[PDB]
A paper describes a structure:
By engineering a small secondary structural element from the rabbit light chain constant domain into the human kappa light chain, we dramatically improved the crystallization of human Fabs and Fab:antigen complexes. Alignment of a human Fab structure onto a rabbit Fab showed that the longer FG loop present in human Kappa constant domains forms a bent and bulging conformation that would interfere with a beta sheet packing interaction. In the case of the FG loop, this consisted in replacing the septamer human sequence HQGLSSP (positions 198 to 204 according to Kabat numbering) between the structurally homologous T and V (position 197 and 205 respectively, according to Kabat numbering), with the pentamer rabbit sequence QGTTS (positions 199 to 203 according to Kabat numbering). The resulting mutant is shorter by two residues, with deletions of histidine at position 198 and proline at position 205, and is referred to here as ΔQGTTSΔ (positions 198 to 204 according to Kabat numbering).
The modified FG loop of the Cκ domain (“Crystallizable Kappa” or more simply “Crystal Kappa”) also enabled crystallization of Fab:antigen complexes. For dupilumab Fab and the other 4 complexes, we utilized the simpler CK1.0 (i.e. only ΔQGTTSΔ). The crystals for both dupilumab and secukinumab required optimization to reach their respective 3 and 3.2Å resolutions. Crystals from the initial screens diffracted to 5Å in the case of the former and not at all for the later. The 3.0Å Secukinumab IL17 complex (and its 2.4Å improved structure) shows two Fabs bound to the IL17 dimer with a discontinuous epitope, each Fab binding portions of both IL17 chains. Because the secukinumab:IL17 complex produced crystals that only diffracted to low resolution, it was selected for further engineering of the CH1 domain isotype and C-terminus. In this series, the IgG1 versions behaved better than the IgG4 and yielded a 2.7Å dataset for the tagged (at 10mg/ml) and 2.4Å dataset for the untagged Fab (at 5 mg/ml) versions directly from initials. This resolution improvement is probably real as the 3.0Å dataset from the CK1.0 (tagged IgG4) construct was obtained after optimization and screening of numerous crystals, rather than straight from initial trials.
Numbering used by the authors:
A (entry chain B), E (entry chain B): 1 to 212
B (entry chain C), D (entry chain C): 41 to 129
C (entry chain A), F (entry chain A): 1 to 227
Write the structure that this text describes.
């Protein structure tokens, strides 16, 4: 079964630039039967390149295909906003057909610090025996950032989960929800809840006292 | 030949003779599996066993029950399975 | 106008059955080979099955051996997938796809690539019962002083299956609204957050309400966040 | 069917009609390779492409040059290749 | 292609004992189509076991076969001198047929120290511009032993090669030839040539002076 | 009496050809499938090719693609292997083998295992020319005192190809004689040693001569070791 490995896992570039996408096959792909697909969050894939180098019907000139045997390249010469999506390669030379694991093309821009907000749990949830502290990191760049909950100064681990939005259509930033999750009995024994965000050197810390 | 048992796409044979149909000696080839038997002896379902069919001439009386000369009818018979893949190599 | 419309998704228990259906509108169905390609939430693309023009040939991925059955109906212009004894690992969005064919002389040449795709349906295989969301208000410890730009939100905790749709003030509030992808808790239930950052001068004037719509459970929670 | 081009053991067809031989429409199947074409589209020589042969009935005049009724002769014709292995699975 | 791995690489046992030979298959071997062959130095292989458990025609009762799928065992219950040979397993369930890399069954006995002899090169070879110093390690047990040439006390490396006999039919020992190989000009500049053998604790050193 | 006799070995240059022949004496040849299995000096067993009862089918190992050709002659009861464009890695002892067959009802069942083998021939693929051995005496620095059991030998240096056969005193001296397997020097030529340990009282009475027989070069060296 041919195993397609794509490089990089994720590619941060700015519109106007040239994107160079790699698909490495575990075995020689017969008669260069390799296709490339584009996939925007929430939508379904779209065929771009076939037979390693041929552009599909409608696909603009800026999309280019190269490769033979085991190494295959997809190139987008002068990047436009609508080109920032996930990219899969697929082979149709060996049975069964296999796909690459994907490479997302992200819109690289100026660093931005999030606007950190900390929301305490509601007295509605408190009567249900569970405490949920959410921290929001509003509009920031790049995706990487480190949130670390602190309860009565003690650092938390194993009791949090987070989620990140897709890249903003207009400002190209990222937002991040983080949820600490404790028992009502736990929360009711501590006064300080702090959400700590770290981007590079800086370490912003939004907080609250239980009785406030 | 024992190709029927040693093929990647093995097949079983099924003999028949309808009350008027001639000759009596006609073994119809039927595929054993949907998939093919790989080199390791396992069935792989990204490949298919397909029967190769042949259009040929068979003996038939019209009007029926006659031991002389008449017009012979059509016959569609599968004589052996082969292993196919969706890829045109 | 050439389209593919999947249907048949939904929550199933481990051991269950489902039958996905795909309506192939705007083209002569008999001319193409069709396939089912799945995508686990977040993970990549994976081929499930393939089918001949007339169904003479049925190709399958190893993982679905004698559990899944592809089938078609060139008269009813439809493609189906019979999913039996479903395992949790079958949780995915299933796409029905059209296989590019060419004709050199009088010979049909099938290629195992997909020039047309459908919107795909989400199949969820879990033991968890359908649970409507418990919706909570996300509000700053105290309005007073705080800052000039307030954040407000909705914690949509403990819902199953996916999806929910959050909306603000009956979809009038669209600007600077961030609805976070859901995270599957340790309880096997999803939780998510919708947030809005409004001028803190607007609080005490404008009311802020989020519209949590959980169609798998026909539940709809409309919650007013108060500073 | 295009099985001849999509089989693991692909074959080419060769039409013929000897001066007296009938019917004229008989395409003799000949194997493309000694080995078989694996899933990766390569030839593997630990497997062999073999032609499936069928014993059937063909039209022949005896004495020759006659457009009437007579006795039909024997015909040995390969109609399609299959992939075999030395192992009986 | 099924890959058969045999364990151990070599098995030292004494006649009367029970030998337990292992053949591990990289994939399930179809219908337990596994054979075992015996091979004595200089001779050609001989079939012993077929279908994983069946003894071939003539093979004595003491030879036993076990296994199914990936793990297969060959057992010789009460070892006899004629059973000490190399053993290969072979599968015939997957095409192509593959063999195990082998396991030799050696006649384990009492430790014996070699009778070390050092032969200097001949004046015949010396006029041909090359010096060859051979050290013989006569009749010893077990096979393992370390020879280390020494020239004017300096330890030699990269200029020696050795060879070992098969296991002696009568006394079950091993002999070992070792050849140091130098230029005539080299040999003619040094006086002490020493062959040093090491078995366990002991380190016997046969030697000579060039002019003797 | 049922036997297999290989012939056709010998030194070949890289790029060369050879044809191995195997005489199948004492059994009806037409009934069995045959194979060529090679063994590099010291290394293990490796299947090269296989052949049908009548030659209808010819199976080959990947490494020998379009370079080797198995063939038979049921009338001349023989099996052949046509070795073309030989590479150094082809250096090995080649065995011709008989494939066990069974008959359940009226059906022949071939099994890919070998109930009968031959003595095998040694094929050597190298650029090195045939070189006769340079034979030297192995004698203690000085007879006098030394010990009671003297060792004596023959250094058979720089010969090609293999084999040599060493013998002592026209094969009269067999007891306590050790002929060492040859080691292939850095020059691509073999060297070996034959040794004898005799009572040191015998020296000065008995003469000791070794008989180095290099049949690939028709050379025969008879050397007298003197204390």
């Amino acid at each position: 079964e041919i195993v397609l490995t794509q490089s990089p896992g994720t590619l941060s570039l700015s519109p106007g630039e040239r994107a160079t996408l790699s698909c490495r096959a575990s075995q020689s792909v017969s008669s260069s039967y390799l296709a490339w697909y584009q996939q925007k969050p929430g939508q379904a894939p779209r065929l771009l390149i076939y037979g390693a180098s041929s552009r599909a019907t409608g696909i603009p000139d800026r999309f280019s295909g190269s490769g033979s045997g085991t190494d295959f390249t997809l190139t987008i010469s002068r990047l436009e906003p609508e080109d920032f999506a996930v990219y899969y390669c697929q082979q149709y030379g060996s049975s069964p057909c296999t796909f690459g694991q994907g490479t997302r093309l992200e819109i690289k821009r100026t660093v931005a610090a999030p606007s950190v907000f900390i929301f305490p749990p509601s007295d509605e949830q408190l009567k249900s025996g569970t405490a949920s502290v959410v921290c929001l990191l509003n509009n920031f760049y790049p995706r990487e950032a480190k949130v670390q909950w602190k309860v009565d100064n003690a650092l938390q681990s194993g009791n949090s989960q987070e989620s990140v939005t897709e890249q903003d259509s207009k400002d190209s930033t990222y937002s991040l929800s983080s949820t600490l999750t404790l028992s009502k009995a736990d929360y009711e024994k501590h006064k300080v809840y702090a959400c700590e965000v770290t981007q590079g050197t800086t370490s912003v810390t939004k907080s609250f006292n239980r009785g406030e | 030949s024992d190709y029927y048992n040693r093929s990647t796409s093995p097949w079983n044979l099924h003999r028949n003779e309808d009350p008027e149909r001639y000759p009596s000696v006609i073994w119809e080839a039927k595929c054993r599996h949907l998939g093919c038997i790989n080199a390791d002896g396992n069935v792989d379902y990204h490949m298919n066993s397909v029967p190769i069919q042949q259009e040929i001439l068979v003996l038939r009386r019209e009007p029926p029950h006659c031991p002389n000369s008449f017009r012979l009818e059509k016959i569609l018979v599968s004589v052996g399975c082969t292993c196919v893949t969706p890829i045109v190599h | 106008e050439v389209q593919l419309v999947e249907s048949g998704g939904g929550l199933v228990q481990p051991g269950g059955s489902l039958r996905l259906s795909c309506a192939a509108s705007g083209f002569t169905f008999s001319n193409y080979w069709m396939n089912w390609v799945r995508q686990a939430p977040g993970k990549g693309l994976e081929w499930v099955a393939a089918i001949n023009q007339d169904g003479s040939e049925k190709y399958y991925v190893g993982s679905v051996k004698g559990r899944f059955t592809i089938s078609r109906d060139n008269a009813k212009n439809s493609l189906y997938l019979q999913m039996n004894s479903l395992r949790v690992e079958d949780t995915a969005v299933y796409y029905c796809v059209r296989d590019y064919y060419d004709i050199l002389t009088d010979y049909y040449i099938h290629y195992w690539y997909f020039d047309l795709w459908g919107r795909g349906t989400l199949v969820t295989v879990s033991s968890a019962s359908t649970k409507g969301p418990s919706v909570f208000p996300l509000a700053p410890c105290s309005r007073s002083t705080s800052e000039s730009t307030a954040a407000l939100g909705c914690l949509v905790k403990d819902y199953f299956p996916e999806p929910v749709t959050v909306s603000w003030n009956s979809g009038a509030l669209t600007s600077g609204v961030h609805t976070f992808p859901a995270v599957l808790q340790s309880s096997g239930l999803y939780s998510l957050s919708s947030v809005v950052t409004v001028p803190s001068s607007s609080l005490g004037t404008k009311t802020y309400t989020c519209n949590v719509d959980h169609k798998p459970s026909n539940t709809k929670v409309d919650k007013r966040v108060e500073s």
